[PDB]
């Protein structure tokens, strides 16, 4: 088909600037970070115009207290390095950077700038520690028992989140003046967000096996109670996650919470009209609410609420814009009676019924939400509708649903994926069906083509697992433990659920995209698969790529990993 058009469109989708809202600084300017093709810059936004604060690209910026007249840039000390330096920029003098020399190179994990002290967590060779940098120099407030993140500061009280053991995220506090550490264990749940009330309590999002709650943790005694808000929109929403929360300067509590792959914005419990998708932090700016917004049809952008009008968004050309046309959540009926929550991104370049890709997510412990995805957008741009099923094993729909995969790889979850394909069929969406996925999704491609021949017209398997038994034996102890958990410790399940053992059954074209030198997705087992495919007469395409990396950031990453899947599907279509 139209190869150069697909490439031009992929270039634009890769290059589109994506924005996140960091806070309000200086006198009522938005601090926003923009990401374009693996390059991060920080900006002041003030009504139409953006002004870049940093010189060379950065990693991130620390969280500013409302109105502070400076920004703290976090920047990799080397190309790719996992160690950082801190640089201050005065908001009145953008582009002029002052290296914070008192802070040696370390892995900067998080931070908040009070305007009087930069309070941050960092990992060195020796430790993870909470630090404060002020006029007198650098102080270590506390050593932390593992990775921790500062969430908020009000006066001398510091609140944060810690991966301090037990499998879940604890809350912690420290004191700006005297340091120390107080940890508040999350019990059956896991803390997701925290902000300090004007009354010096820690409001926190506490995610659980089912619904998330908003709790008040008293830092004087560790008492935890459900926090009741003046408006009951938030509690009647029944969130499963709490993304972020924060007190606004007027003392009202802003909460962003999620359920079923989309978020909602609340101010003192009252829900605010917001564009469908997912949202980030909320600020009050010139007396109006502002957030970031993303969806399957919309790259991360800054919007005004309640209108949803974009204040800052990357440009896509009209033609590409119209190709990526609208997302929706459908509950697909599987075999169990179970209902598989499935996102659908419609293509403006495909008729209905049209060519449809079931794009299976990796993990498996991950979620397909209504959030911008370069892969789904590229497929839509190339004239495919995209179906993204949260097969059992997925996160975002409670622990019971995630746990269903355990013991049963290439079982119920493959039935869920197949259920989503039949639904695409059964609803009038799909004229023809393809499967594509990476990581566990690549494994699902192979499982589909082996266990459900005739379901899909062709399949793309990226960074797939081909044989659990071999993998278990090749692997490091972390990955070995996962394989042991997934398979229920049965060598018999390792074998029967391994697609290399069922190559005879494949009847459809298969494209393999695979890293040449990735430690946890090794090439040898894939060479075996290809040998098995060739021996048994099967149509296959293969692309073996050195240094594939682990995110599609640049056009080069896309050309290596995404383009071959798209060109392969486009040629299989016609």
The one of Na ion, a second copy, none whose footprint includes residue 218, by CB under 5 to 8 A per kind, is none
- List, as one string, the DSSP characters of 22-71: EEEETTTEEEEEEESSS-EEEEEE-SS-EEE--SS-BSEEPEEPTT-SEE
Residue 12 or 29 with smaller CB distance to a second copy: 12
Return the half-sphere exposure (C-beta side, CA atoms, 13 A cut-off) of residue 88: 19
Q: What is the rounded distance in angstroms from the CA atom of residue 378 to the CA atom of residue 460?
A: 15
Q: What is the rounded distance in angstroms from the CA atom of residue 126 to the CA atom of residue 128?
A: 7
Q: How far is the CB of 285 from a second copy (least distance, A)?
A: 36
Q: Does 368 bind Na ion (CB under 5 A)?
A: yes
- List, as one string, the DSSP characters of 374-398: HHHHHHHHTT-EEEEE--TT-SSS-
Q: How far is the CB of 368 from Na ion (least distance, A)?
A: 4
- Which residue sits closest to Na ion, CB atoms considered? 368
Residue 38 or 411 with smaller CB distance to a second copy: 38
Q: How far is the CB of 381 from Na ion (least distance, A)?
A: 16
Q: What is the rounded distance in angstroms from the CA atom of residue 562 to the CA atom of residue 511?
A: 12
Both tokens of 355, joined, read 């060519």
Q: Does 335 bind a second copy (CB under 8 A)?
A: no
Stretch in the footprint of Na ion (CB under 5 A) among 64-72, 333-341, 369-377, 486-494: 369-377
Per CB under 8 A, contacts with a second copy among 267-326 are: none
Cα of 564 vs its chain's centroid, Å: 24
The one of Na ion, a second copy, none whose footprint includes residue 234, by CB under 5 to 8 A per kind, is none
Per CB under 8 A, contacts with a second copy among 535-574 are: 539-547, 555-556, 559-560, 563, 567-568, 571
Residue 7 or 138 with smaller CB distance to a second copy: 7
The one of a second copy, Na ion, none whose footprint includes residue 333, by CB under 5 to 8 A per kind, is none
Size of residue set near a second copy by CB under 8 A: 34
The one of Na ion, a second copy, none whose footprint includes residue 128, by CB under 5 to 8 A per kind, is none
Q: Does 55 bind a second copy (CB under 8 A)?
A: no
Q: Does 373 bind Na ion (CB under 5 A)?
A: yes
Residues contacting residue 258 through CB under 8 Å, at least 6 positions apart:
239, 240, 241, 242, 243, 264, 278, 369, 396
Q: At what angle do helices 3-15 and 563-573 cross, to 10 degrees?
A: 140
Q: How far is the CB of 373 from Na ion (least distance, A)?
A: 4
| CB of 473 closer than 8 Å to CB of 459 | no
440 φ, ψ (degrees, to nearest 5)? -60, -30
Q: Which residues pair with 119 in a beta bridge?
A: 112, 132
Q: What is the rounded distance in angstroms from the CA atom of residue 293 to the CA atom of residue 280?
A: 7
Stretch in the footprint of a second copy (CB under 8 A) among 18-26, 84-92, 420-428, 531-539: 531-539
Q: What is the rounded distance in angstroms from the CA atom of residue 389 to the CA atom of residue 441?
A: 11
Q: Which of 419, 466, 459 is nearest to 435 (CA)?
A: 459
Per CB under 8 A, contacts with a second copy among 487-516 are: 509, 511, 516
The one of Na ion, a second copy, none whose footprint includes residue 368, by CB under 5 to 8 A per kind, is Na ion
- Total Cβ atoms within 10 A of residue 261: 24
The one of Na ion, a second copy, none whose footprint includes residue 474, by CB under 5 to 8 A per kind, is none
Q: Does 370 bind Na ion (CB under 5 A)?
A: no
For binding to Na ion (CB under 5 A), which residues are involved? Answer: 368, 373
Q: Which residues bind a second copy (CB under 8 A)?
A: 1, 3-4, 7-8, 11, 79, 509, 511, 516-517, 523-524, 527, 530-531, 534, 539-547, 555-556, 559-560, 563, 567-568, 571
């Amino acid at each position: 088909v139209e190869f150069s058009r697909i490439v031009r469109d992929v270039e634009r989708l890769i290059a589109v600037e994506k924005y996140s809202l960091q806070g309000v600084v200086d006198g009522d300017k938005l601090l926003v970070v923009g990401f374009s093709e693996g390059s991060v810059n920080a900006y002041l936004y003030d009504g139409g115009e953006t002004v870049k604060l940093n010189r060379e690209p950065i990693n991130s910026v620390l969280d500013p207290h409302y109105g502070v007249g400076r920004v703290i840039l976090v920047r990799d000390v080397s190309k790719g390095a996992e160690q950082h330096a801190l640089f201050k920029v005065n908001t009145s003098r953008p582009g002029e950077e002052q290296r914070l020399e008192a802070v040696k190179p370390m892995r900067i994990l998080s931070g908040v700038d009070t305007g009087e002290a930069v309070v941050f967590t960092g990992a060195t060779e020796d430790r993870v520690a909470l630090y404060a940098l002020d006029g007198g120099g650098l102080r270590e407030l506390a050593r932390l028992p593992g990775f921790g993140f500062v969430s908020d500061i009000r006066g001398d009280l510091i609140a944060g989140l810690g991966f301090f053991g037990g499998g879940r995220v604890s809350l912690f506090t420290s004191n700006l003046s005297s340091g120390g550490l107080r940890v508040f264990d999350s019990g059956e749940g896991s803390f997701s967000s925290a902000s300090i009330s004007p009354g010096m309590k820690v409001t926190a999002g506490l995610e659980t096996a089912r619904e998330a709650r908003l709790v008040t943790v008293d830092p004087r005694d560790g008492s935890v109670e459900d926090l009741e808000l003046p408006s009951k929109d938030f509690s009647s929403y029944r969130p499963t996650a709490i993304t972020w929360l924060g007190y606004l300067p007027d003392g009202r509590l802003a909460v962003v919470a999620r359920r079923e792959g989309r978020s909602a914005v609340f101010i003192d419990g009252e829900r605010v009209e917001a564009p469908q998708g997912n949202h980030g932090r909320v600020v009050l700016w010139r007396g109006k609410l502002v957030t970031s917004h993303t969806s399957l049809s919309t790259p991360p952008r800054i919007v005004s609420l309640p209108s949803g009008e974009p204040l800052l968004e990357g440009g896509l050309p009209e033609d590409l814009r119209r190709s990526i046309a609208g997302s929706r959540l459908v509950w697909v009926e599987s075999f169990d009676g179970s209902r598989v929550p499935t996102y659908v991104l419609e293509s403006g370049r495909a008729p209905t019924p049209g060519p449809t890709v079931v794009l299976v997510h990796g993990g498996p412990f991950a979620e397909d939400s209504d959030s911008w995805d370069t892969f789904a957008a590229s497929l839509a741009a190339a004239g495919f509708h995209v179906v993204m099923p949260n097969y059992r094993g997925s996160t975002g729909y409670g622990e019971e649903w995630r746990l269903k995969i355990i013991g049963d790889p290439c079982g119920g979850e493959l039935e869920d994926v197949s259920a989503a394909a039949r639904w695409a069929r059964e609803s009038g969406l799909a004229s023809e069906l393809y499967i594509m996925g990476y990581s566990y999704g690549g494994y699902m491609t192979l499982c589909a083509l082996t266990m459900k021949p005739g379901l899909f017209k062709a399949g793309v398997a990226g960074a797939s697992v081909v044989d659990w038994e071999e993998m278990y034996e090749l692997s490091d102890a972390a990955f070995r433990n996962f394989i042991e958990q997934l398979t229920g410790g049965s060598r018999e399940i390792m074998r029967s659920r391994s697609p290399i053992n069922h190559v005879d059954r494949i009847k459809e074209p298969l494209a393999l995209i695979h890293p040449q030198n990735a430690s946890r997705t090794p090439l040898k087992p894939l060479l075996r698969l290809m040998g098995e495919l060739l021996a048994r007469g099967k149509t296959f395409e293969a692309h073996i790529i050195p240094d594939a990396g682990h995110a599609i950031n640049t056009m080069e990453d896309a050309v290596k990993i995404l383009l071959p899947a798209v060109f392969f599907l486009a040629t299989q279509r016609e």
